[PDB]
Design a protein around this ligand. Structure first.
Ligand SMILES: *[C@@H]1O[C@H](CO)[C@@H](O)[C@H](O)[C@H]1NC(C)=O
Ligand SMILES: *[C@@H]1O[C@H](CO)[C@@H](O)[C@H](O)[C@H]1NC(C)=O
Lengths: 186, 177, 13
């Protein structure tokens, strides 16, 4: 289909800093990708973001009842929903499964540390060779979202293994209380 | 530190709408517009929280009305198609004969309309596939996941085929053992 | 137990 498309988007955003100590609410309106008007809880009124949003701001700012709804949002909406969902979202912890397998950059000179299934996203992966950290020659996929509330990442060490060498992939992650380490021997 | 977003959209002339909550970029739930039901992204979510799906339908009705208003305001300026970037990956390291999941990741595109087909040895597959709704991005494009559970063999090749009005021809992304 | 929505505003012509 070649007919032109037109998209309206709205995003009501709750931003949380140190739990619910500092909360910021943004009521954001978009035409295609262009945000045209916004309510910011730091401001307490709608403000046009672009020319297209001026009529919106004036209209909604003339409605005192609407504005007072939005000014309480940090309490009645953001902090509220934070409390309802905190246990299965903020407190969700899924620890990583760690696999090490060899590979070849050219038809093994590549050690893959596959870190799978963890939540949340923040993770540190390090490579060791006979107890020494190996920082040169590391490439990674970066952080990958699986879309099912888990992450994965592959961290690859370029190296020429000599016999009698032990390589160690070490994984740190908030679900862990001490680093997770997997060895590979040549 | 943490961000919860209630994200809505409404698309003309397709008359497609969507309503969902997002936590740090993962979907908490969305509202099936046809069945008028809350669909939890993970089953366990629905046993600690509830959501009245009716109110979402009201928000989409306003979104539709506002889209009419903003369309006129823009002098009927339409969206510009942004084509997707597609990646195929596995859930976990691939072992022969041990079940796994192919993931087709469609990212950074708009409008939120896409045809996605899994092909095994060049033939469309249907059995056991699943997918997400359109997940919003911070640059206000979209992303989407498609899933195909499978048994890894040396016989089978797979491709994820993505069609989008921004592409001149379908995008195929390949995977094999 | 209940997640709250946040109402979308009808704009003006
Ligand atoms: C819409 O058209 C009016 C004239 O009718 C013009 O003043 C305005 O700038 C146009 N807006 C856009 C975004 O094209
Ligand atoms: C999906 O395929 C149908 C035909 O089966 C076509 O009408 C539609 O435009 C396609 N969508 C996209 C985004 O290519």
């Amino acid at each position: 289909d070649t007919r032109p498309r037109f998209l309206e988007q709205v995003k009501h955003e709750c931003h949380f800093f140190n739990g619910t100590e500092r909360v910021r609410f943004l009521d954001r309106y978009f035409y295609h990708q262009e945000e045209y008007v916004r309510f910011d809880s730091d401001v307490g009124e709608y403000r046009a973001v672009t020319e297209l949003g001026r009529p919106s701001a004036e209209y909604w700012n003339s409605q005192k009842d609407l504005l007072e709804q939005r000014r309480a949002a940090v309490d009645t909406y953001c902090r509220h929903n934070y409390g309802v969902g905190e246990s299965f979202t903020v407190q969700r912890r899924v620890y990583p499964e760690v696999t090490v397998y060899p590979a070849k950059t050219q038809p093994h000179n590549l050690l893959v540390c596959s870190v799978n299934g963890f939540y949340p996203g923040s993770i540190e992966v390090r490579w060791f060779r006979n107890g020494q950290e190996e920082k040169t020659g590391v490439v990674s996929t970066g952080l990958i979202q699986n879309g099912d509330w888990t992450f994965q990442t592959l961290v690859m060490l370029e190296t020429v293994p000599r016999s009698g060498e032990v390589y160690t992939c070490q994984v740190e992650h908030p679900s862990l209380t001490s680093p997770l380490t997997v060895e590979w021997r040549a | 530190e943490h961000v919860i977003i209630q994200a809505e959209f409404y698309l003309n002339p397709d008359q497609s709408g969507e309503f969902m909550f997002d936590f740090d970029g993962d979907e908490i739930f969305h509202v099936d517009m046809a069945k008028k039901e809350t669909v939890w992204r993970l089953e366990e979510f629905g046993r600690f929280a509830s959501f009245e799906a009716q109110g979402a339908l009201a928000n989409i009705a306003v979104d539709k009305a506002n889209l009419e208003i903003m369309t006129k305001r823009s002098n009927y300026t339409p969206i510009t198609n942004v084509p997707p970037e597609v990646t195929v990956l596995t859930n976990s390291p691939v072992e022969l004969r041990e079940p796994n999941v192919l993931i087709c990741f469609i990212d950074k595109f708009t409008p939120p309309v896409v045809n996605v087909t899994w092909l095994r040895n060049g033939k469309p597959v249907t059995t056991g596939v699943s997918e997400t709704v359109f997940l919003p991005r911070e640059d206000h494009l979209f992303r989407k996941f498609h899933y195909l559970p499978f048994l890894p063999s040396t016989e089978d090749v797979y491709d994820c085929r993505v069609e989008h009005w921004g592409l001149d021809e379908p995008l195929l992304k390949h995977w094999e053992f | 137990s209940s997640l709250n929505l946040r109402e979308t505003n009808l704009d003006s012509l």
